[PDB]
Amino acid sequence: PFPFGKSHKSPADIVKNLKESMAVLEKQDISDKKAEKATEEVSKNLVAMKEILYGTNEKEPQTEAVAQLAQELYNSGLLSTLVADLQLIDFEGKKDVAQIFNNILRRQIGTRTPTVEYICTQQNILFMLLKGYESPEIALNCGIMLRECIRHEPLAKIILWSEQFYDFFRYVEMSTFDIASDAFATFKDLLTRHKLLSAEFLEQHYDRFFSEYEKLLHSENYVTKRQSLKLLGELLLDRHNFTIMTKYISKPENLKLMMNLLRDKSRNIQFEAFHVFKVFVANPNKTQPILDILLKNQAKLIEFLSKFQNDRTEDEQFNDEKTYLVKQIRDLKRP
Amino acid sequence: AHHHHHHMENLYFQSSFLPEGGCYELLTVIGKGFEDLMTVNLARYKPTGEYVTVRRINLEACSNEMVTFLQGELHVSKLFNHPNIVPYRATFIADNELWVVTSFMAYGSAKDLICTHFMDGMNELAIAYILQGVLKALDYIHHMGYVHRSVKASHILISVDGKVYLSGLRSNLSMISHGQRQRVVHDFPKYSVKVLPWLSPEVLQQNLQGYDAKSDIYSVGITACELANGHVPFKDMPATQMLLEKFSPHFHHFVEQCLQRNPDARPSASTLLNHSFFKQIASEALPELLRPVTPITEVDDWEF
Ligand SMILES: Nc1ncnc2c1ncn2[C@@H]1O[C@H](COP(=O)(O)OP(=O)(O)OP(=O)(O)O)[C@@H](O)[C@H]1O
């Protein structure tokens, strides 16, 4: 590769160059050389933009260059175009888009966060990133970008209140485990980061969410079931979700499921089932159908709990919890 | 708004391996790792008959932290694409087990080669070809803002046609915190008891100054000694091997450069590639240097 020199270019001309090269790539009816040329140019411009924002091993980023670039990026709609056309970009440029996007997104003038403001005017960016999970070539980079978006509450809210959020229940069970894992990470972050927002989402969408969530707890995928059961326990024990939790632990069919998951072949699964089961029983205001199930299996539960993972030896919380549940269930009187 | 929605069809005339257990017929165990929890199998990819490697770990024997650590490897390996970094082809759950499929390297690892034949260490020309490939890989990994953290002979694989690949991506660690590169990092490599002898003093002395990419450069040197002698320095030595950590002449100067106490004094992988040591120099020179090794071509149920 013949080592030519690099000519310096303004942020404005770089944005312009990329805009024109992206337009070429979107077209089908161009020669292989014209497509190749545009491929090389997109790649080189993206490297140039990245270097303005992160600097190099020798130079740190300078604020004037950064501010010109962000401005130009917002005015051109290229933040939208690069996400929309992500599939058309080379392997390393796709990673460059993610890095550029993430850096702009963290940009903060005073208390304000201008990129968040911009994505609120341009919300399909979020939905294009989410849809990216369905395409193996762009999924990981979309995931990285989306996970940085949802750090900001307004952007988290847009996704949580959409129809498209429920697509996650498909994505987390995808047979390519690297992408399924990535998607479950974003899904868990959404439900756990902005706890007030998440509590409101769960109260307002209770029935649809837990209907979908119930399916995850029946998954033929071992990790889906293990992870989902764990997240469930962490969600119900959170003080922000008290209202949701009291609804959940009042339904007979949920107790049935937890009781069954206590008899799963997986030691891990039955332990994470315990974390949810314990809450149904600790509850002082148990409904009749709940109270009926505990009295029906009173002797069996006492016996089961006495011999339940006894080799789990220095978890003092688990031991005391088991003691408490046995007392509670023993103290159940039939009126 | 683009005109490439015919992409599904645009290619698929070729890629990925099917992410399904049934597609693989397990043959021999070729290796073992992850604290004895991973079995490395040679396999036949049924749809092509082609040979591949299947890495299998029982997730039931893994803590939550161990599962997180493992999912990190899958993330990092899909970010990397380089001629000297081992490609990953598929990753899926075959239930209760994580299966990770990579291409099969028919000469195994540099450590395998040492054990099967070169027990007294490899010839010097071979070491130059091998360590050049490792260095190209490390250069790429370092430019990406990562540290490897487990460069050793068993993490260097050699294919049927003499290509060298760095493996061992499970231990890779990002120095990118809060969207920015950090000059030093402080994480003690989890589940790396055994990798200790290849570790630089500044990675080992936890709670002190911390480390960067030049720690990998020290591991290159230890690996050079491992490849020359057939044994790693400080083997069988107690944990406080710390204290002691505190052939052509070009080879010697190569090794002595990697092994400098001061990491700031150590050269980067890119400038190390310009070192005199590699002047003696790839996919037709190595198979021959590896001669005569031949590769093969209680309670009753609830009532409701
Ligand atoms: N793609 C491959 N082709 C051929 N052999 C392989 C391949 N991957 C792994 N092996 C063999 O299996 C051994 C163990 O695999 P690997 O080094 O990935 O496990 P590890 O958990 O990193 O090992 P340890 O815990 O001992 O450090 C390798 O040293 C090598 O001999």
Last residue of a domain, one of B65, B83, B107: B107
The answer to whether B78 contacts chain A (CB < 8 Å) is yes
Report the C-alpha gap between A78 and B70 in whole angstroms.
Answer: 35
**Do residues A273 and A261 touch, judged by C-beta distance below 8 A?**
yes
Whether residues B118 and B55 fall in one domain:
no
Whether residues B130 and B88 fall in one domain:
no
Q: Is residue B2 part of a domain?
A: no
Q: CB–CB of A178 and B91 under 8 A? A: yes
Report the C-alpha gap between A203 and A251 in whole angstroms.
Answer: 16
Least CA distance to A91: which residue of chain B?
Answer: B81
The alpha carbon of B295 and the centre of ligand 1 are apart by a number of angstroms equal to 16
Whether residues B286 and B181 fall in one domain:
yes
Residues 6+ apart with CB under 8 A from B30: B40, B41, B42, B53, B108
- List C-alpha distances in Å: B188 to B199, B207, B241: 11, 9, 16
Q: Using the atom order of ligand 1, give the atom closest to the CA of residue B35.
A: 25
A32-54 vs A63-76: helix axis angle to the nearest 10? 140
The answer to whether B9 contacts chain A (CB < 8 Å) is no
Report the C-alpha gap between B259 and B282 in whole angstroms.
Answer: 26
C-beta of B40 in contact with ligand 1 (< 6 A): yes
Chain B residue numbers with beta carbons less than 8 Å from the beta carbon of A296 are 303-304
User: Can you list the alpha helix ranges (DSSP code H) found in chain B?
Assistant: 7-10, 64-79, 110-116, 124-143, 201-204, 214-229, 242-245, 249-258, 269-272, 286-289
Query: Between B90, B92, B302, which is nearest A297 by CB?
Result: B302
C-alpha A237: how far from its chain's center? Answer: 20
Whether residues B41 and B160 fall in one domain:
no
| DSSP string for A20-34 | HHHHHHH-SSS-HHH
Nearest to A133 by CA among A145, A124, A150, A120: A145
Nearest to B273 by CA among B85, B111, B136, B103: B136
Report the C-alpha gap between A58 and A10 in whole angstroms.
Answer: 19
- At residue B53, φ and ψ (nearest 5 deg) are -110, 130
Last residue of a domain, one of B83, B107, B131: B107
Q: Using the atom order of ligand 1, give the atom closest to the CA of residue B33.
A: 21
Chain A residue numbers with beta carbons less than 8 Å from the beta carbon of B67 are 223
Residues 6+ apart with CB under 8 A from A122: A77, A79, A80
Q: CB–CB of B67 and A182 under 8 A? A: no
A119 CB-side CA count, 13 A: 30
Report the C-alpha gap between A234 and B32 in whole angstroms.
Answer: 35
Domains and CATH numbers, chain A: 1-335 (1.25.10.10)
Report the C-alpha gap between B56 and B33 in whole angstroms.
Answer: 10
DSSP 8-state class, residue B195: T
Task: Name B147's bridge partners.
Answer: B173
| b (16+ CB within 10 A) / e for A114-149 | bbbebbeeeeebbbbbbebbeebbbbbbbbbbbbbb
The answer to whether A177 contacts chain B (CB < 8 Å) is yes
Nearest to A179 by CA among A216, A125, A228, A130: A130
The answer to whether A178 contacts chain B (CB < 8 Å) is yes
Angle (CA) A256 A171 A275, round 5°: 30
Least CA distance to B61: which residue of chain A?
Answer: A268
Report the C-alpha gap between A36 and A21 in whole angstroms.
Answer: 11
The answer to whether B13 contacts chain A (CB < 8 Å) is no
The shortest C-alpha distance from A197 to chain B (Å) reads 23
Query: Looking at the 3D structure of chain B, how many domains does it have?
Result: 2
Nearest to B282 by CA among B167, B153, B165, B164: B164
* Radius of gyration, alpha carbons of chain A: 26
Q: Is A278 left (phi over 0), alpha (psi -120 to 50) or beta?
A: alpha
Q: Is residue B6 part of a domain?
A: no
A267-282 vs A252-261: helix axis angle to the nearest 10? 150
Burial label for B177, CB within 10 Å (0-12, 13-18, 19+), is exposed
The alpha carbon of B32 and the centre of ligand 1 are apart by a number of angstroms equal to 6
The answer to whether B7 contacts chain A (CB < 8 Å) is yes
Q: Which two tokens stand for residue B162?
A: 């003499």
In this structure, the number of other CB atoms found within 10 A of the CB of residue B232 comes to 20
- At residue B43, φ and ψ (nearest 5 deg) are -140, 155
- List C-alpha distances in Å: A30 to A19, A44, A81, B1: 17, 20, 20, 16
Q: Using the atom order of ligand 1, give the atom closest to the CA of residue B36.
A: 25
C-beta of B172 in contact with ligand 1 (< 6 A): no
Chain A residue numbers with beta carbons less than 8 Å from the beta carbon of B16 are 136
The answer to whether A181 contacts chain B (CB < 8 Å) is yes
A&B contacts, CB < 8 Å:
86
Report the C-alpha gap between A46 and B296 in whole angstroms.
Answer: 44
Query: Between B64, B98, B180, which is nearest A177 by CB?
Result: B98
Q: Is residue B282 part of a domain?
A: yes
Nearest to B138 by CA among B121, B123, B152: B152
| DSSP string for A156-203 | HHHHHTSSGGGGHHHHTT-SSHHHHHHHHHHHHHHHHSSHHHHHHHHH
Whether residues B183 and B244 fall in one domain:
yes
- Diameter of chain A by CA atoms? 91
Whether residues B64 and B33 fall in one domain:
yes
Report the C-alpha gap between B138 and B213 in whole angstroms.
Answer: 9
Residue with tokens 């999970």: A133
In single-letter form, the type of residue at position A140 comes to L
Helices (H) and strands (E) in chain B, counts: 10, 11
Q: Using CA atoms in the order A296, A299, A305, A306, what is the torsion angle rounded to 10 degrees?
A: 180
Q: CB–CB of B299 and A85 under 8 A? A: no
Q: CB–CB of B78 and A85 under 8 A? A: no
A298-306 vs A288-296: helix axis angle to the nearest 10? 70
- List C-alpha distances in Å: B189 to B194, B196, B200, B223, B272: 11, 10, 12, 18, 25
H/E element, B158: strand B156-158
Chain A residue numbers with beta carbons less than 8 Å from the beta carbon of B302 are 259-260, 263, 297, 300
Whether residues B73 and B158 fall in one domain:
no
Whether residues B188 and B216 fall in one domain:
yes
Report the C-alpha gap between A150 and A168 in whole angstroms.
Answer: 14
Which CATH number characterizes residue B271's domain? 1.10.510.10
- List C-alpha distances in Å: A60 to A10, A47, A52: 17, 15, 9
Last residue of a domain, one of B59, B91, B107: B107
Report the C-alpha gap between A202 and A209 in whole angstroms.
Answer: 7
Report the C-alpha gap between A17 and A27 in whole angstroms.
Answer: 16
Q: Which two tokens stand for residue B294?
A: 């031949």
The alpha carbon of A153 and the centre of ligand 1 are apart by a number of angstroms equal to 43
Q: Tell me if the bond preceding B83 is cis, omega within 30° of 0.
A: no
- At residue A283, φ and ψ (nearest 5 deg) are -60, 120
Report the C-alpha gap between A283 and A278 in whole angstroms.
Answer: 9
* Resolution as reported, in Å: 2.3
Report the C-alpha gap between B179 and A242 in whole angstroms.
Answer: 35
DSSP 8-state class, residue B266: S
Residue with tokens 């206590």: A262
Q: Is residue B149 part of a domain?
A: yes
| b (16+ CB within 10 A) / e for A173-208 | bbebbbbbbbbbbbbbbbbeebeebbbebbeebeee
Residues 6+ apart with CB under 8 A from A312: A271, A318
User: Can you list the alpha helix ranges (DSSP code H) found in chain A?
Assistant: 11-26, 32-54, 63-76, 78-84, 91-105, 114-121, 124-131, 139-149, 153-160, 168-171, 177-192, 195-204, 206-216, 222-236, 242-248, 252-261, 267-282, 288-296, 298-306, 316-330
The answer to whether A304 contacts chain B (CB < 8 Å) is yes
Q: Give the range of the structural domain holding residue B44, as residue numbers without chain letter.
A: 19-107
Q: Is B194 left (phi over 0), alpha (psi -120 to 50) or beta?
A: left
The answer to whether A312 contacts chain B (CB < 8 Å) is no
SS3 B55: strand
Q: Using the atom order of ligand 1, give the atom closest to the CA of residue B34.
A: 21
Q: CB–CB of A221 and B93 under 8 A? A: yes
The answer to whether A38 contacts chain B (CB < 8 Å) is no
Q: CB–CB of B303 and A296 under 8 A? A: yes
Report the C-alpha gap between A288 and B186 in whole angstroms.
Answer: 55
In single-letter form, the type of residue at position A167 comes to D
Least CA distance to A302: which residue of chain B?
Answer: B299
Report the C-alpha gap between B37 and B61 in whole angstroms.
Answer: 8
Q: Which two tokens stand for residue A211?
A: 């209907």
**Do residues A174 and A183 touch, judged by C-beta distance below 8 A?**
yes
Chain A residue numbers with beta carbons less than 8 Å from the beta carbon of B79 are 95, 140
Report the C-alpha gap between A289 and A302 in whole angstroms.
Answer: 19
Residues of A (225-284) whose Cβ lies below 8 Å from B: 226, 230, 252, 256, 259-260, 263, 266-268
DSSP 8-state class, residue A333: -
Report the C-alpha gap between A72 and A15 in whole angstroms.
Answer: 7
Q: Is residue B97 part of a domain?
A: yes
The alpha carbon of A182 and the centre of ligand 1 are apart by a number of angstroms equal to 25
The answer to whether A195 contacts chain B (CB < 8 Å) is no
Which CATH number characterizes residue B90's domain? 3.30.200.20
Whether residues B137 and B285 fall in one domain:
yes
The alpha carbon of B132 and the centre of ligand 1 are apart by a number of angstroms equal to 20
- List C-alpha distances in Å: A54 to A281, B9, B182: 54, 37, 12
Burial label for B216, CB within 10 Å (0-12, 13-18, 19+), is buried
C-beta of B41 in contact with ligand 1 (< 6 A): no
Q: Is residue B9 part of a domain?
A: no
Q: Is residue B301 part of a domain?
A: yes
Whether residues B93 and B118 fall in one domain:
no
In single-letter form, the type of residue at position A45 comes to N
Q: CB–CB of A176 and B298 under 8 A? A: no
Whether residues B162 and B267 fall in one domain:
yes
Instruction: Name the structure determination technique.
Output: X-ray
**Do residues B183 and B98 touch, judged by C-beta distance below 8 A?**
no
Whether residues B257 and B135 fall in one domain:
yes
- At residue B299, φ and ψ (nearest 5 deg) are -80, 145
**Do residues A269 and A261 touch, judged by C-beta distance below 8 A?**
yes
Q: Is residue B5 part of a domain?
A: no
Report the C-alpha gap between B138 and B221 in whole angstroms.
Answer: 13
Residues 6+ apart with CB under 8 A from A272: A226, A229, A230, A233, A261
